[PDB]
């Protein structure tokens, strides 16, 4: 079947790495939700921005299908950048709306996990001291809501560049919300904390870059996998993510990386024509 | 207020123009829907896959603001590439998740009309004989469900290049589903059929270009503005979307195009900076 994960937070979930900094993930198994159904997934995956690049969710996904070369993993994007905890509130759009976009999922697949990662715009004055009280009641809508109170859910810290360079100088009280993150993992059931130490950013001092968000999304999955919580980064980190790199392509795979060629214009009919056959009269 | 407008369609209503032969559009008075709320529009707006390109829509709103300097204009994107008319039956997801859609803009907006453009996949092997009935019901459920029994409708034909090349080369039906979407129209109340003569297509030989997307957006306006059929190509089209590309651009705007800039890697911080201030201590 089809095992669904619902993504959730703000737009370090949604993911800001630039795409081109990293190896683009092609797998035929991973797949993602556009407006109500399955479809391959091709990052940016949780385009709420038109500056949507790179999530953690590539490499979680990637590392899924390795685990499981028999099923297909679907990815459900539903954060929103700048979101704060209070914008995530049960009444809330941006909340009703990720309920929505997890039925339709659903219809078509199971919800087996869910991937939150907020607290940016919670990292200053105060407010941190009603952060966990708040963030119970949206995880307790959502099992309740979406019938899995059991599932795993996998929240993320925050990168420790915050509260220091321009765009995200402004978040002094990060690793305020880290311990409520922290705790509440602990405390609640089913819920999973994962460091984000090491991790580094962008050039606007706020967002997780490529490269950190493709060894974020390894933790999530450790974290998901083993049912435990990520509290130091994985020693294999960076060979673990090559060795996902590495994997050979399926036909359609490769084929596809060339049906998006030739869409995008990148190259010409016959280029594209000669590029098929190439795959079509390949051995192995 | 914010007049929204849904999108509904296949691939040539999501848009598939090449982005980078067409002049950027931004208007802070077009907006688009993210995740159940608005945003600044910014192409692909209708991001159904990682190919999305220009829309007829973008065209269509920037001509809408140009009439109503007051107000501001919100797309609802819900085009499927590659759907037909038979997956948007009622009870089909796609359509139940444009009406979700749909519902999320209006508890922010007032949809004051809705753009259709599909039948490319119908456009083979008769089932043209059967597309008015279709239409129809999935009309009818429209207007019924949102509670718009005569918000204008606009629908588009399709392009003449169709059945002939490539990916376009087995719609040879695409005439008869004109003669039906026209028809539709004339009999049909509140619905204004647009003419696609003249319209070129991308290399596929199946999308309508950037270019032409650009016209065709004109087009529909044409026909919702004045509430009539466009059968024939306005003749200031050329020269009308100039006019709109000459537009001075606000401080809000310009500010816009540079935060993305920065924010996509670009340029520099201080080039960020540099260019900012610029900005701000302007004249006029």
Same mark, same amino acid.
């Given at each position: 079947?089809?095992?669904? !994960? ?16 990293? /190896?683009?993930?092609?797998?035929? *198994?991973?797949?993602? %939700?556009?407006?109500? *159904? ?10 709420? *921005? /038109? ?21 297909? $993993?679907?990815?459900? &994007? ?6 704060? $905890?209070?914008?995530?509130? %049960? +009444? ?10 997890? #039925? ?5 697949? =199971?919800?087996?996990? $869910? ?22 009641? $949206? ?10 109170? +059991?599932? /795993? ?12 360079? *321009? ?35 962008? &050039? ?11 060894? !974020?999304?390894?933790?999530? !999955? ?9 509290? =130091? /980064?994985?020693?294999? =980190?960076?060979?673990?993510?090559? %060795? ?9 795979? #490769?084929?596809?990386? #060339? ?6 214009? #990148? ?14 009269? +390949?051995?192995?």
């Amino acid at each position: 079947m089809v095992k669904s !994960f619902l993504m959730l937070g703000q737009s370090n979930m949604a993911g800001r790495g630039f795409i081109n900094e990293v /190896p683009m993930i092609y797998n035929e *198994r991973i797949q993602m %939700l556009r407006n109500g *159904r399955w479809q391959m997934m091709t990052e940016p995956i949780n385009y709420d *921005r /038109p500056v949507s690049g790179i999530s953690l969710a590539g490499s979680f996904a990637d590392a899924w299908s390795q685990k499981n070369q028999e099923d297909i $993993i679907g990815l459900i &994007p539903c954060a929103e950048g700048g979101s704060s $905890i209070d914008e995530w509130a %049960l +009444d809330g759009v941006l909340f009703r709306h990720a309920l929505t976009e997890a #039925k339709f999922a659903m219809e078509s697949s =199971e919800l087996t996990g $869910i991937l939150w990662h907020q607290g940016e715009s919670d990292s200053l004055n105060g407010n941190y001291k009603v952060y966990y009280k708040k963030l119970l009641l $949206i995880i307790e809508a959502l099992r309740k809501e979406l019938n899995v109170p +059991d599932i /795993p859910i996998i929240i993320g810290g925050l990168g420790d560049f915050l509260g220091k360079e *321009r765009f995200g100088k402004g978040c002094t009280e990060y690793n305020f919300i880290n311990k409520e993150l922290q705790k509440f993992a602990f405390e609640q059931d089913n819920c999973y904390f994962v460091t984000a130490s090491g991790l580094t950013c962008n &050039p606007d001092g706020i967002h997780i870059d490529a490269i950190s968000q493709r060894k !974020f999304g390894l933790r999530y !999955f450790e974290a998901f996998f083993n049912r435990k919580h990520v509290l =130091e /980064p994985l020693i294999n =980190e960076n060979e673990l993510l090559n %060795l996902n790199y590495a994997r050979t392509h399926t036909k359609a795979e #490769k084929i596809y990386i #060339k049906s998006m060629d030739f869409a995008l214009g #990148k190259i010409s009919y016959d280029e594209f024509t000669s590029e098929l056959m190439k795959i079509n009269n +390949d051995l192995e």
